Amino acid sequence: MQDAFTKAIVAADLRGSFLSEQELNQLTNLVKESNKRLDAVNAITGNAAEIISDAAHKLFAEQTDLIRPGGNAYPNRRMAACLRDMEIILRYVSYALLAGDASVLEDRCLNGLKETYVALGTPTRSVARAVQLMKETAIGYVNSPSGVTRGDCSALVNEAATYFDKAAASIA
Amino acid sequence: MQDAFTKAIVAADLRGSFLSEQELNQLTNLVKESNKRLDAVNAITGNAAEIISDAAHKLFAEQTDLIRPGGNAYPNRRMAACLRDMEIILRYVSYALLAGDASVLEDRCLNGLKETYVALGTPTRSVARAVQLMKETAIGYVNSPSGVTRGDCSALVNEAATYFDKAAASIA
Amino acid sequence: MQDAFTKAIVAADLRGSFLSEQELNQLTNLVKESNKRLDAVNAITGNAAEIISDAAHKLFAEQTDLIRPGGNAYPNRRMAACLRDMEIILRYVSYALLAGDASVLEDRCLNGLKETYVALGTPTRSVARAVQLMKETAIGYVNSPSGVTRGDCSALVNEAATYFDKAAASIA
Amino acid sequence: MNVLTTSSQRGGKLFKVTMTLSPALSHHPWPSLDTYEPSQNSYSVVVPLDRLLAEMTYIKNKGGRVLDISPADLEALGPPDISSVAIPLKVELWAKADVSDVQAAIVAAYKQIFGNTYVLESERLTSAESLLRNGSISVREFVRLLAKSELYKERFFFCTSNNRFTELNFKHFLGRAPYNQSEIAAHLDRYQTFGYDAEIDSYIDSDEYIQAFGENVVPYYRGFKSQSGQTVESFNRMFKLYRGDAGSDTNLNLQGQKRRVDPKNLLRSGRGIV
Amino acid sequence: MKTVITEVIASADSQGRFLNNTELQAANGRFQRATASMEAARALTSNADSLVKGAVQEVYNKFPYLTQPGQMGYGDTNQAKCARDISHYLRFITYSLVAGGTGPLDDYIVAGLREVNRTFNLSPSWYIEALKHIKGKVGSQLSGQPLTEANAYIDYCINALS
Amino acid sequence: MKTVITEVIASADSQGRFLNNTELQAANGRFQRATASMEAARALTSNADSLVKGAVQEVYNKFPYLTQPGQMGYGDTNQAKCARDISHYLRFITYSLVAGGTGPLDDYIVAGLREVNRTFNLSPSWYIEALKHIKGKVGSQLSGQPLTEANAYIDYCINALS
Amino acid sequence: MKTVITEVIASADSQGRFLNNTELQAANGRFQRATASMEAARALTSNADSLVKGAVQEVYNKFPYLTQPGQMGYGDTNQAKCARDISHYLRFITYSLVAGGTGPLDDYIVAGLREVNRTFNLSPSWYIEALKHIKGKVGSQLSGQPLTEANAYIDYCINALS
Amino acid sequence: MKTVITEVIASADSQGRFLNNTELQAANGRFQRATASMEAARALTSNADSLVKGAVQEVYNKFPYLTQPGQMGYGDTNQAKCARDISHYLRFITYSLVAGGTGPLDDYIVAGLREVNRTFNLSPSWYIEALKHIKGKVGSQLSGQPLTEANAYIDYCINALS
Ligand SMILES: CCC1=C(C)/C(=C/C2=NC(=C\c3[nH]c(/C=C4\NC(=O)[C@H](C)[C@H]4CC)c(C)c3CCC(=O)O)/C(CCC(=O)O)=C2C)NC1=O
Ligand SMILES: CCC1=C(C)/C(=C/C2=NC(=C\c3[nH]c(/C=C4\NC(=O)[C@H](C)[C@H]4CC)c(C)c3CCC(=O)O)/C(CCC(=O)O)=C2C)NC1=O
Ligand SMILES: CCC1=C(C)/C(=C/C2=NC(=C\c3[nH]c(/C=C4\NC(=O)[C@H](C)[C@H]4CC)c(C)c3CCC(=O)O)/C(CCC(=O)O)=C2C)NC1=O
Ligand SMILES: CCC1=C(C)/C(=C/C2=NC(=C\c3[nH]c(/C=C4\NC(=O)[C@H](C)[C@H]4CC)c(C)c3CCC(=O)O)/C(CCC(=O)O)=C2C)NC1=O
Ligand SMILES: CCC1=C(C)/C(=C/C2=NC(=C\c3[nH]c(/C=C4\NC(=O)[C@H](C)[C@H]4CC)c(C)c3CCC(=O)O)/C(CCC(=O)O)=C2C)NC1=O
Ligand SMILES: CCC1=C(C)/C(=C/C2=NC(=C\c3[nH]c(/C=C4\NC(=O)[C@H](C)[C@H]4CC)c(C)c3CCC(=O)O)/C(CCC(=O)O)=C2C)NC1=O
Ligand SMILES: CCC1=C(C)/C(=C/C2=NC(=C\c3[nH]c(/C=C4\NC(=O)[C@H](C)[C@H]4CC)c(C)c3CCC(=O)O)/C(CCC(=O)O)=C2C)NC1=O
Ligand SMILES: CCC1=C(C)/C(=C/C2=NC(=C\c3[nH]c(/C=C4\NC(=O)[C@H](C)[C@H]4CC)c(C)c3CCC(=O)O)/C(CCC(=O)O)=C2C)NC1=O
Ligand SMILES: CCC1=C(C)/C(=C/C2=NC(=C\c3[nH]c(/C=C4\NC(=O)[C@H](C)[C@H]4CC)c(C)c3CCC(=O)O)/C(CCC(=O)O)=C2C)NC1=O
Numbered sequence A, B, C: 001m002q003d004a005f006t007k008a009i010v011a012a013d014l015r016g017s018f019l020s021e022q023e024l025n026q027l028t029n030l031v032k033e034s035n036k037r038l039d040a041v042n043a044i045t046g047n048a049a050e051i052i053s054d055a056a057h058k059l060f061a062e063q064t065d066l067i068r069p070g071g072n073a074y075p076n077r078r079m080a081a082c083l084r085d086m087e088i089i090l091r092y093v094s095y096a097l098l099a100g101d102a103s104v105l106e107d108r109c110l111n112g113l114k115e116t117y118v119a120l121g122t123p124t125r126s127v128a129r130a131v132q133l134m135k136e137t138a139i140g141y142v143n144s145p146s147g148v149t150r151g152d153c154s155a156l157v158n159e160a161a162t163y164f165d166k167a168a169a170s171i172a
Numbered sequence D: 001m002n003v004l005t006t007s008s009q010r011g012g013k014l015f016k017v018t019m020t021l022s023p024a025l026s027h028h029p030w031p032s033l034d035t036y037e038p039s040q041n042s043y044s045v046v047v048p049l050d051r052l053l054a055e056m057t058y059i060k061n062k063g064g065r066v067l068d069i070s071p072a073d074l075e076a077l078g079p080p081d082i083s084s085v086a087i088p089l090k091v092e093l094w095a096k097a098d099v100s101d102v103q104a105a106i107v108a109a110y111k112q113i114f115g116n117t118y119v120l121e122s123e124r125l126t127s128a129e130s131l132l133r134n135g136s137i138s139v140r141e142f143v144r145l146l147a148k149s150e151l152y153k154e155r156f157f158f159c160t161s162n163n164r165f166t167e168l169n170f171k172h173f174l175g176r177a178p179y180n181q182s183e184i185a186a187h188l189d190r191y192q193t194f195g196y197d198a199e200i201d202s203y204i205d206s207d208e209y210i211q212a213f214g215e216n217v218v219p220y221y222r223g224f225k226s227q228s229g230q231t232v233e234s235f236n237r238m239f240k241l242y243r244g245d246a247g248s249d250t251n252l253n254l255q256g257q258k259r260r261v262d263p264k265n266l267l268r269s270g271r272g273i274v
Numbered sequence E, F, G, H: 001m002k003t004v005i006t007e008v009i010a011s012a013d014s015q016g017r018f019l020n021n022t023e024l025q026a027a028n029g030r031f032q033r034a035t036a037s038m039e040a041a042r043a044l045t046s047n048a049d050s051l052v053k054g055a056v057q058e059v060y061n062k063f064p065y066l067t068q069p070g071q072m073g074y075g076d077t078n079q080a081k082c083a084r085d086i087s088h089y090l091r092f093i094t095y096s097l098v099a100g101g102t103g104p105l106d107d108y109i110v111a112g113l114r115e116v117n118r119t120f121n122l123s124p125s126w127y128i129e130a131l132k133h134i135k136g137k138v139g140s141q142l143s144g145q146p147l148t149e150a151n152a153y154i155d156y157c158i159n160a161l162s
């Protein structure tokens, strides 16, 4: 598994080199913003259930097809599987966000996922949408939390978004 | 696994409906003929060994190449495998016959079977024939049995053959 | 698994026949040369480590890219894997040499090996070369050992070579 | 479990199997609901011959579906050697043919157009060959004649689906794999409304065909080399399409004429509408 | 899908064995029992409409506050999705009656129930009370072994929710 | 296929290990023993014809009733398939002699024996009696270590059938 | 690759669990400690080569027979491959410093070390002595928590080689 | 019992390696964080009495009907067992604060929670609402990293109950 430092190290090694002063300071900045990062990961963990629930309510509000017999979130067994997958993806997105690298998300979650769903008959476009809704709400929480020091988290909100967007793209 | 009732239920559910009076009475009739069905399954169980043996004797009577060196029912190891497969197929045909549905046969036995045999070099046309012979003899026994009230057991006899014919078709 | 006798037996059986006087004497000759064969297998076992080591030193002498970063025998983990594979192949070549038949080599070692290496990004041409070097040194030892009775081992040296050459061909 | 090494241990014939599993065989040890890894949706495992019957029975029961069984040793010898066909030898028919110049062409058109299946001597299109010899028709003209023939219709069309036919058609007539899902669809709709014959014409009067083969050149392989407006994944399709020098199109396979290019694979190169 | 027939077949298969007198005796039970089961099924089927409206209302009468604004028994959509859900339960009860086992209930309502109800803030108490009411009224639509069957499956759902 | 050579190789491979002095000593046994084995093999090979006819008949002489009508030693096809079967046994005995182990017998006759014999109503007693007779006559075709080898494998078949 | 971040994530994942306050507290340690780590990293980075030439020579001075002909500290290629190897170690030490864990050392030098050294007749003693020397000189390039970090990883390599 | 210290030790043990510098910072995180944690702990400890009475009442104010006769917020024993239960939660929150991880919560409240609540007809909604209220008031007893810690664990309980 990689994190943002480990990634630097692998690229350096492929040159046969000690880390460039370029790469060093990029990583010094990561350490600089790490308290914000911890709050951002904490924002997701602290509202995981609601993020999934709210995404869910809204997914089925939009797409009643899945809720009706013949639909991929019917009966209870399938809805529980769908709720479970929403959690799994939100979980690996939070891991990527602590790590500063998408690899755990791509390697443990996204790799093969689309082909799984197609084999199952699970409508990937609906799954992509459920991921887009989790993103909206998750970022909502990253941006408006309990008594965190005021500052600018937009860099981290972007990065979190790209992890949500990776997952969506990979699946649709 | 499905039986004839379970099949009805799955189709009803896909409509979002309680079972149609149409489907209800089709199932009432299956209950009506169920004593005959039990005798039919019992006919096969009670003569399983002879059904396999007699099919076998006749298969190798016809295809004397299988029992020559170079042949797929030579030496003892291969003959035992062939005798075993005859039993396995007769077994899943009897299960389908108790169930009133082919699914256990198709899902647990026939699915992939042809491609197995081709990988192995097992001549599928010979296997199909062994199944045709089991069918002849299996259907034979049910008709004349020891001391059963006289009536028409005929309609029941047709249910077996399609299961034997499914297997044959699937394999050849 | 086959040895040279077992091979004879399988071909005889496919005719439905007791072994031909032809085949009998071919096998009588294998028994005739078996002390030499034991010395030949013993030559490899008794110098396995040096055969691998010397092949290795020379492989990386020629292909200094493998031990640079980016190279398939870098870092220590990969070099240990490469040294291990050299041993595995030398091992199955010695087994084939005791057996008088390549089958154990082809079935347990060479089957699928090329496709493994390609999946891994392991340069097959370099692996083929490492096998060619093991051959040179191994045969060196088969031909010039400790106080073995003087005679002609060229037949066995050829046969050992074909096992090394099978492996090389199969992999490159 | 994936791509294998070796075959046997005590001795066996290893077969590698492939399935599609429920969370009944493999699940994570997590707090909720049983799920298998999404990327092991179809999983494959290599089992020696005795354990094989027991494994298939188990898999089928706990819900999986066997997709394939194939001996391991078949599958260890890689992918085809393509040296003969990376860059082929072109054969072209000149204006005043030489009597055996024309002999060269016929043998090659046969091999290439029919996809290396044997065309027995009772079988050959003799009247049509008469025509090429006298110059009444040209090499492309003759190539169209073979395609509309029964022999071509019979080994490649009548017994397989349209997906397969079109995929073979690209291989034979154009020498390259089929690039898009649209290509398959565009063709199937044509056959449906203008018939078999109009559809055959559509590869032989195409701009792509005309550039490369012109009119006196026998269609030759060209998909193992980069082409224009070719998606990138059409170079892996070519391996699926051509199985080596000794491989052929063959309708005599035990399983019948079937596909070779996965439908899922085609979609990776793009999906639109129409 | 669990029925007497599938169960005995499963047990035979897993021992590599033909169906024997043990397994056929079992099957006869399921077939002998079909008449009572299917009478319950027909009665529950034609009364479905009112059984559902009766139970839906009873959820509001037992949990009055649900029907106030800001609550989950308010507005057309909640009250619509409720009727639907009880209707799902009665539907699977009839299926379980007809099928000769709990399979339809196990596969379509029980597997996953709690996870779903917990994510969506649905209290089992409502559903138990819907079912307790349905059980009260089914006392006078059926009697004898059809009632016992209806009861068996209604109670099965109530235990699944406790 | 079980031979001394395959056995030692199997044991090395399974420990990821080169053949060592233990394994090569073993192999020397198999090679030293080849002369006696192969003498037995040649004698059994050229006498095959009569060894088979001798044993076939002895099955009928010991089980007289087999040769009456309605029985399994009657008619050309039964008596033909019998000679063939004893011939199969002698064939694999010679193979086991030549191979240096029971492999050929284990793989081609022992694996599956009882299932086959049981489905086809073939009594092992016949086959034991065929082999007991073959053992009697091989007493005067061979002697010393070739006889011991012949015996080893004939007896191995008789134990496989008991 | 082992870092505080990857470790806590691994532990969460393996229990199917979101990161919680336990895991985020851990991460804060790694981030709070980056300043000292990265100061050590910059100092070790700029003052680099000579450490390699110093340690290479010391291997020959402590094992004189090394720099004599017929030995493994003789000729340009041995002495070149030595400098390179110590340079590899220092490189991975800096990586481990920057990464927040032993991962780079574990994956690129420790995994396989002994097998390689044993096949190539490389004595760990040299490498320990190279590292002991590097540890002596790093005493005056750093101090406080940067020195403790440098030490942690140098010592980690010495234990890997004993 | 899950703490940063026990987690890293567990990971070493299962892996057999000495606690080394990658691990030491994990531990340093837990130790650096103790001050904020323990400030939250002291504030939650001395306000316990009122935090509990505040949350208990809020359960009745948000679910008015609970306090009517025949209901589970009526009579001394229900209302007594409620205060106790919220007090248990606050107690384990302080323990988790002091311990440096969720262990005390995981072992004494989370493991088994749903089974117990389901058998005893206890709705999680009450408990979430007790905790939401406790979270509101703890906004003005603490600030900065002590508040973040208090929040982390309160939210952890709310997610355990959803
Ligand atoms: C237990 C694991 C752990 C966490 C969670 C942690 C958080 C943490 N967040 C901090 C700052 C902060 N955190 C944020 C975060 C935000 N600002 C906003 O306006 C957004 C809504 C939000 C975006 C994510 C900001 C702006 C600061 C102040 C600037 C800084 O220190 O970088 C600080 C520095 C002290 C302070 O200023 O309060 C700490 C220790 N430390 C830890 O050890
Ligand atoms: C799901 C239930 C099920 C079926 C149906 C099944 C079929 C099956 N038949 C097999 C072999 C076999 N099957 C036969 C059958 C025949 N040979 C002939 O010549 C005849 C035409 C035919 C008998 C009528 C033979 C000879 C083999 C052994 C092939 C070999 O190893 O060479 C094998 C390979 C594993 C083994 O040998 O045990 C499987 C999996 N396995 C199963 O688990
Ligand atoms: C232990 C498993 C089991 C078995 C085996 C079973 C048999 C069974 N067979 C029955 C009837 C019967 N069974 C037969 C069968 C036949 N009639 C003929 O003339 C043919 C020779 C034979 C064709 C298969 C007939 C004709 C009846 C009466 C009609 C009917 O009940 O359908 C009945 C109804 C009672 C009776 O009339 O005797 C039972 C219970 N019940 C069981 O629970
Ligand atoms: C059946 C007996 C058997 C063989 C033959 C075998 C080969 C084999 N070699 C492997 C890796 C390897 N093999 C090598 C070998 C080399 N690298 C080079 O640059 C050289 C050209 C070459 C040495 C001469 C390397 C470097 C790897 C590791 C590849 C990686 O993980 O990046 C792997 C992947 C699993 C692992 O790394 O342990 C297998 C299965 N495995 C077996 O079980
Ligand atoms: C422990 C297992 C085992 C071994 C290893 C073994 C070896 C062995 N090698 C022998 C002969 C020999 N071995 C060789 C071998 C060679 N000649 C050469 O010049 C080559 C360098 C080398 C080629 C391989 C030769 C030429 C003879 C004498 C001829 C013969 O007996 O075939 C002999 C016969 C006695 C003798 O003449 O010394 C034995 C017993 N016996 C055993 O039981
Ligand atoms: C590596 C982490 C990981 C992921 C991501 C994963 C996905 C995954 N989702 C699955 C099923 C499923 N996934 C869903 C999801 C949905 N249904 C819908 O209609 C919605 C569009 C969507 C929810 C947003 C459903 C309904 C099933 C069950 C399909 C079935 O059995 O019919 C399965 C089959 C096994 C099972 O059902 O447990 C896997 C492996 N498994 C994993 O181990
Ligand atoms: C549409 C149906 C059709 C016809 C009718 C046809 C005729 C035809 N006859 C040809 C040649 C020929 N035709 C003959 C025929 C004869 N030689 C004699 O001396 C006899 C008088 C006569 C036989 C009775 C010969 C010898 C040639 C070869 C001329 C040459 O190449 O020198 C050619 C040149 C191409 C070739 O050689 O294959 C054509 C096109 N082609 C056709 O496709
Ligand atoms: C061998 C004879 C033969 C068959 C049977 C055949 C099927 C077939 N159907 C196709 C597409 C299609 N088939 C359908 C059919 C349907 N859509 C629905 O929603 C309905 C459920 C269903 C109509 C009942 C649709 C919509 C497509 C286009 C899919 C797309 O491009 O997105 C394609 C892809 C190529 C193309 O679009 O022309 C093939 C090959 N092709 C053949 O050559
Ligand atoms: C690259 C050079 C090359 C080779 C080697 C080649 C082999 C080859 N042999 C084939 C068929 C065949 N090969 C045989 C051969 C045999 N049948 C037996 O029983 C014997 C054991 C054996 C003869 C010794 C048979 C009978 C077929 C036809 C199979 C069928 O259609 O049923 C086919 C299928 C296409 C066709 O039938 O024309 C190919 C591609 N093709 C090539 O292009």
Ligand SMILES: CCC1=C(C)/C(=C/C2=NC(=C\c3[nH]c(/C=C4\NC(=O)[C@H](C)[C@H]4CC)c(C)c3CCC(=O)O)/C(CCC(=O)O)=C2C)NC1=O
Pocket: A057, A060, A067, A073, A074, A075, A076, A079, E056, E059, E066, E072, E073, E074, E077, E078, E079, E081, E082, E083, E085, E086, E088, E089, E108, E109, E116, E120, E122, E126, E127, E130
């Ligand atoms: C196949 C078997 C099956 C069952 C049993 C089932 C239950 C079920 N009930 C749901 C929602 C619901 N269920 C109710 C239930 C009620 N509201 C009230 O007025 C009453 C208090 C109560 C009826 C007693 C409500 C209000 C919702 C909407 C929840 C939401 O999305 O906020 C949902 C979420 C998807 C959706 O919004 O439809 C499921 C899956 N789904 C199934 O597929």
Ligand SMILES: CCC1=C(C)/C(=C/C2=NC(=C\c3[nH]c(/C=C4\NC(=O)[C@H](C)[C@H]4CC)c(C)c3CCC(=O)O)/C(CCC(=O)O)=C2C)NC1=O
Pocket: B057, B060, B067, B073, B074, B075, B076, B079, F056, F059, F066, F072, F073, F074, F077, F078, F079, F081, F082, F083, F085, F086, F088, F089, F108, F109, F116, F120, F122, F126, F127, F130
């Ligand atoms: C490779 C090793 C191998 C063996 C050993 C073998 C035995 C064997 N004996 C068989 C039949 C037979 N075996 C006999 C044996 C005898 N009949 C007599 O007159 C005597 C009593 C006796 C000889 C002592 C008979 C009569 C049959 C025919 C059984 C039948 O089909 O009814 C069959 C059934 C297939 C067939 O009909 O040929 C097998 C497989 N098959 C093999 O492949």
Ligand SMILES: CCC1=C(C)/C(=C/C2=NC(=C\c3[nH]c(/C=C4\NC(=O)[C@H](C)[C@H]4CC)c(C)c3CCC(=O)O)/C(CCC(=O)O)=C2C)NC1=O
Pocket: C057, C060, C067, C073, C074, C075, C076, C079, G056, G059, G066, G072, G073, G074, G077, G078, G079, G081, G082, G083, G085, G086, G088, G089, G108, G109, G116, G120, G122, G126, G127, G130
């Ligand atoms: C990524 C981490 C990594 C390490 C640590 C590493 C060590 C390493 N040292 C090697 C050789 C060597 N190492 C040395 C070492 C020394 N010679 C001297 O003068 C001194 C005594 C000593 C330095 C202290 C020598 C002489 C060789 C050449 C050995 C040979 O091929 O004979 C080789 C063999 C391949 C080659 O010849 O380069 C490896 C893999 N390789 C790696 O990839």
Ligand SMILES: CCC1=C(C)/C(=C/C2=NC(=C\c3[nH]c(/C=C4\NC(=O)[C@H](C)[C@H]4CC)c(C)c3CCC(=O)O)/C(CCC(=O)O)=C2C)NC1=O
Pocket: H056, H059, H066, H072, H073, H074, H077, H078, H079, H081, H082, H083, H085, H086, H088, H089, H108, H109, H116, H120, H122, H126, H127, H130
């Ligand atoms: C160590 C951690 C721990 C927890 C969290 C815990 C919860 C818990 N609450 C219980 C009961 C209870 N819990 C309540 C709760 C409430 N009543 C009200 O007025 C409010 C609605 C609500 C408070 C918000 C009630 C009324 C009971 C009595 C239930 C009964 O026995 O009927 C019981 C049953 C044993 C008993 O009767 O005491 C347990 C185990 N037990 C533990 O050991």
